Amino acid sequence: IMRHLPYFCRGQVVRGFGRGSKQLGIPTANFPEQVVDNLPADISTGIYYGWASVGSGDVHKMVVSIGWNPYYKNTKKSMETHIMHTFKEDFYGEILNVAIVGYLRPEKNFDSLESLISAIQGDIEEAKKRLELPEYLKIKEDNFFQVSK
Numbered sequence: 001i002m003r004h005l006p007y008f009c010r011g012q013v014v015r016g017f018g019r020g021s022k023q024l025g026i027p028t029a030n031f032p033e034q035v036v037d038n039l040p041a042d043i044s045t046g047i048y049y050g051w052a053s054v055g056s057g058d059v060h061k062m063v064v065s066i067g068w069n070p071y072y073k074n075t076k077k078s079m080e081t082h083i084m085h086t087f088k089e090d091f092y093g094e095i096l097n098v099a100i101v102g103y104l105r106p107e108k109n110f111d112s113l114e115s116l117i118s119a120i121q122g123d124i125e126e127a128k129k130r131l132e133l134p135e136y137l138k139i140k141e142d143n144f145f146q147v148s149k
Protein backbone atom coordinates (compact mmCIF):
# COMPACT_ATOMS: atom_id res chain seq x y z
CA ILE A 1 0.00 0.00 0.00
CA MET A 2 3.10 2.12 0.46
CA ARG A 3 4.00 1.06 -3.06
CA HIS A 4 4.35 4.87 -3.32
CA LEU A 5 8.06 4.47 -3.98
CA PRO A 6 10.63 5.73 -4.26
CA TYR A 7 11.49 5.08 -0.64
CA PHE A 8 14.71 6.70 0.61
CA CYS A 9 16.97 5.66 3.47
CA ARG A 10 20.65 5.57 4.40
CA GLY A 11 22.48 2.79 6.17
CA GLN A 12 26.01 2.02 7.31
CA VAL A 13 27.58 -0.75 5.23
CA VAL A 14 28.29 -3.71 7.52
CA ARG A 15 29.52 -7.32 7.27
CA GLY A 16 27.19 -10.01 5.92
CA PHE A 17 27.74 -13.78 5.75
CA GLY A 18 30.56 -13.39 3.25
CA ARG A 19 28.55 -15.07 0.49
CA GLY A 20 27.93 -12.55 -2.27
CA SER A 21 31.30 -12.02 -3.80
CA LYS A 22 32.60 -15.44 -2.61
CA GLN A 23 29.75 -17.69 -3.78
CA LEU A 24 27.85 -15.60 -6.26
CA GLY A 25 30.42 -13.29 -7.73
CA ILE A 26 27.87 -10.57 -6.82
CA PRO A 27 28.75 -8.48 -3.74
CA THR A 28 25.92 -6.84 -1.81
CA ALA A 29 26.26 -3.93 0.59
CA ASN A 30 24.38 -4.89 3.79
CA PHE A 31 22.49 -2.60 6.14
CA PRO A 32 22.48 -2.89 9.97
CA GLU A 33 19.51 -4.74 11.52
CA GLN A 34 18.26 -1.42 12.94
CA VAL A 35 17.77 -0.04 9.44
CA VAL A 36 16.00 -3.20 8.23
CA ASP A 37 13.63 -3.58 11.14
CA ASN A 38 12.73 0.12 10.93
CA LEU A 39 11.65 -0.23 7.30
CA PRO A 40 8.05 0.90 6.61
CA ALA A 41 5.57 -1.99 7.02
CA ASP A 42 4.10 -1.50 3.55
CA ILE A 43 7.47 -2.39 1.97
CA SER A 44 7.10 -6.02 1.01
CA THR A 45 9.89 -8.50 1.19
CA GLY A 46 11.32 -9.09 -2.27
CA ILE A 47 13.75 -7.86 -4.88
CA TYR A 48 13.75 -4.23 -5.96
CA TYR A 49 15.76 -1.98 -8.30
CA GLY A 50 16.79 1.60 -7.63
CA TRP A 51 19.52 4.16 -7.10
CA ALA A 52 22.40 4.33 -4.65
CA SER A 53 25.51 6.27 -3.74
CA VAL A 54 28.33 5.44 -1.35
CA GLY A 55 29.11 8.41 0.82
CA SER A 56 29.38 11.53 -1.23
CA GLY A 57 30.02 9.52 -4.37
CA ASP A 58 27.99 9.43 -7.55
CA VAL A 59 24.59 7.84 -7.81
CA HIS A 60 24.50 4.50 -9.70
CA LYS A 61 21.87 1.93 -10.58
CA MET A 62 21.35 -0.99 -8.19
CA VAL A 63 19.18 -3.87 -7.16
CA VAL A 64 18.41 -4.58 -3.55
CA SER A 65 17.06 -7.64 -1.78
CA ILE A 66 14.80 -7.28 1.30
CA GLY A 67 14.06 -10.56 3.01
CA TRP A 68 15.30 -13.86 4.39
CA ASN A 69 17.14 -15.34 1.37
CA PRO A 70 15.14 -18.61 0.83
CA TYR A 71 18.14 -20.32 -0.72
CA TYR A 72 20.26 -19.85 2.41
CA LYS A 73 17.35 -19.79 4.85
CA ASN A 74 18.45 -16.84 7.03
CA THR A 75 16.90 -16.32 10.43
CA LYS A 76 17.08 -12.51 10.36
CA LYS A 77 15.55 -10.39 7.60
CA SER A 78 18.22 -8.47 5.65
CA MET A 79 18.61 -5.57 3.23
CA GLU A 80 21.36 -6.02 0.65
CA THR A 81 22.20 -3.69 -2.19
CA HIS A 82 24.20 -4.68 -5.22
CA ILE A 83 25.33 -1.60 -7.14
CA MET A 84 25.89 -1.93 -10.86
CA HIS A 85 29.22 -0.16 -10.69
CA THR A 86 32.82 -1.23 -10.35
CA PHE A 87 34.52 0.11 -7.23
CA LYS A 88 38.25 -0.12 -6.65
CA GLU A 89 37.98 -0.71 -2.92
CA ASP A 90 35.45 -2.11 -0.48
CA PHE A 91 33.30 0.43 1.36
CA TYR A 92 32.56 -1.21 4.72
CA GLY A 93 31.69 1.46 7.28
CA GLU A 94 30.57 4.03 4.70
CA ILE A 95 27.05 5.31 4.54
CA LEU A 96 25.07 3.85 1.68
CA ASN A 97 22.35 6.22 0.37
CA VAL A 98 19.43 4.49 -1.15
CA ALA A 99 16.26 5.07 -3.10
CA ILE A 100 14.13 2.03 -3.74
CA VAL A 101 12.14 2.86 -6.83
CA GLY A 102 10.58 -0.32 -8.20
CA TYR A 103 9.55 -3.90 -7.51
CA LEU A 104 10.92 -6.74 -9.61
CA ARG A 105 9.90 -10.01 -7.96
CA PRO A 106 9.70 -11.79 -4.64
CA GLU A 107 12.55 -13.76 -2.98
CA LYS A 108 12.83 -17.40 -4.08
CA ASN A 109 14.48 -20.67 -3.41
CA PHE A 110 16.49 -22.32 -6.18
CA ASP A 111 17.79 -25.79 -6.91
CA SER A 112 21.38 -24.60 -7.37
CA LEU A 113 23.85 -21.77 -7.02
CA GLU A 114 23.74 -21.58 -10.75
CA SER A 115 20.00 -20.97 -10.91
CA LEU A 116 20.24 -18.25 -8.23
CA ILE A 117 23.17 -16.47 -9.85
CA SER A 118 21.25 -16.56 -13.06
CA ALA A 119 18.10 -15.11 -11.48
CA ILE A 120 20.04 -12.35 -9.83
CA GLN A 121 21.81 -11.67 -13.10
CA GLY A 122 18.36 -11.46 -14.58
CA ASP A 123 17.26 -8.86 -12.03
CA ILE A 124 20.29 -6.74 -12.82
CA GLU A 125 19.45 -6.63 -16.53
CA GLU A 126 15.77 -5.98 -16.04
CA ALA A 127 16.79 -3.28 -13.58
CA LYS A 128 19.31 -1.78 -16.05
CA LYS A 129 16.44 -1.29 -18.47
CA ARG A 130 13.68 -0.06 -16.24
CA LEU A 131 15.86 2.48 -14.48
CA GLU A 132 16.19 4.23 -17.84
CA LEU A 133 12.55 5.38 -17.74
CA PRO A 134 12.94 9.16 -17.48
CA GLU A 135 10.47 9.34 -14.59
CA TYR A 136 13.00 7.19 -12.71
CA LEU A 137 16.17 8.89 -13.81
CA LYS A 138 14.86 12.10 -12.32
CA ILE A 139 14.85 10.38 -8.92
CA LYS A 140 18.59 10.26 -9.24
CA GLU A 141 18.50 14.10 -8.99
CA ASP A 142 16.37 14.20 -5.85
CA ASN A 143 17.59 16.50 -3.09
CA PHE A 144 18.18 13.44 -0.91
CA PHE A 145 21.22 12.64 -3.04
CA GLN A 146 22.37 16.21 -3.63
CA VAL A 147 22.84 16.40 0.16
CA SER A 148 24.89 13.18 0.12
CA LYS A 149 27.80 15.23 -1.26
Ligand SMILES: Cc1cc2nc3c(=O)[nH]c(=O)nc-3n(C[C@H](O)[C@H](O)[C@H](O)COP(=O)(O)O)c2cc1C
Binds near residue numbers: 019029071073082
Ligand atom coordinates in the same frame (compact mmCIF):
# COMPACT_ATOMS: atom_id res chain seq x y z
C1 LIG B 1 19.01 -8.58 -6.82
C2 LIG B 1 19.18 -9.70 -5.78
C3 LIG B 1 18.27 -10.77 -5.79
C4 LIG B 1 18.32 -11.76 -4.80
N1 LIG B 1 17.45 -12.79 -4.82
C5 LIG B 1 17.49 -13.79 -3.90
C6 LIG B 1 16.58 -14.84 -3.96
O1 LIG B 1 15.67 -14.83 -4.79
N2 LIG B 1 16.67 -15.91 -3.01
C7 LIG B 1 17.68 -15.90 -2.03
O2 LIG B 1 17.80 -16.84 -1.26
N3 LIG B 1 18.57 -14.84 -1.97
C8 LIG B 1 18.48 -13.78 -2.89
N4 LIG B 1 19.37 -12.70 -2.81
C9 LIG B 1 20.21 -12.53 -1.60
C10 LIG B 1 21.52 -13.29 -1.71
O3 LIG B 1 21.26 -14.67 -1.42
C11 LIG B 1 22.56 -12.72 -0.73
O4 LIG B 1 22.75 -11.33 -1.03
C12 LIG B 1 23.91 -13.45 -0.84
O5 LIG B 1 23.79 -14.77 -0.29
C13 LIG B 1 25.03 -12.70 -0.12
O6 LIG B 1 24.78 -12.55 1.28
P1 LIG B 1 25.79 -11.66 2.19
O7 LIG B 1 25.80 -10.28 1.70
O8 LIG B 1 25.48 -11.90 3.63
O9 LIG B 1 27.24 -12.32 1.87
C14 LIG B 1 19.31 -11.68 -3.78
C15 LIG B 1 20.23 -10.61 -3.77
C16 LIG B 1 20.18 -9.62 -4.76
C17 LIG B 1 21.12 -8.58 -4.72
Ligand SMILES: Nc1ncnc2c1ncn2[C@@H]1O[C@H](COP(=O)(O)OP(=O)(O)O)[C@@H](O)[C@H]1O
Binds near residue numbers: 021
Ligand atom coordinates in the same frame (compact mmCIF):
# COMPACT_ATOMS: atom_id res chain seq x y z
N1 LIG C 1 29.12 -3.06 -6.56
C1 LIG C 1 29.10 -3.36 -5.26
N2 LIG C 1 27.93 -3.49 -4.61
C2 LIG C 1 27.91 -3.79 -3.30
N3 LIG C 1 29.04 -3.98 -2.61
C3 LIG C 1 30.23 -3.86 -3.21
C4 LIG C 1 30.30 -3.55 -4.55
N4 LIG C 1 31.57 -3.51 -4.89
C5 LIG C 1 32.30 -3.79 -3.81
N5 LIG C 1 31.48 -4.00 -2.78
C6 LIG C 1 31.93 -4.39 -1.42
O1 LIG C 1 31.50 -5.75 -1.19
C7 LIG C 1 30.75 -5.81 0.05
C8 LIG C 1 29.69 -6.89 0.03
O2 LIG C 1 30.26 -8.11 -0.43
P1 LIG C 1 29.68 -9.53 0.04
O3 LIG C 1 30.43 -10.63 -0.60
O4 LIG C 1 28.21 -9.53 -0.07
O5 LIG C 1 30.16 -9.51 1.57
P2 LIG C 1 29.15 -9.30 2.79
O6 LIG C 1 28.51 -10.61 3.10
O7 LIG C 1 30.16 -8.95 3.97
O8 LIG C 1 28.28 -8.12 2.58
C9 LIG C 1 30.22 -4.41 0.28
O9 LIG C 1 30.14 -4.18 1.68
C10 LIG C 1 31.29 -3.53 -0.32
O10 LIG C 1 32.29 -3.22 0.65
Ligand SMILES: [Mg+2]
Binds near residue numbers: 017020027028080
Ligand atom coordinates in the same frame (compact mmCIF):
# COMPACT_ATOMS: atom_id res chain seq x y z
MG1 LIG D 1 26.63 -8.50 1.35
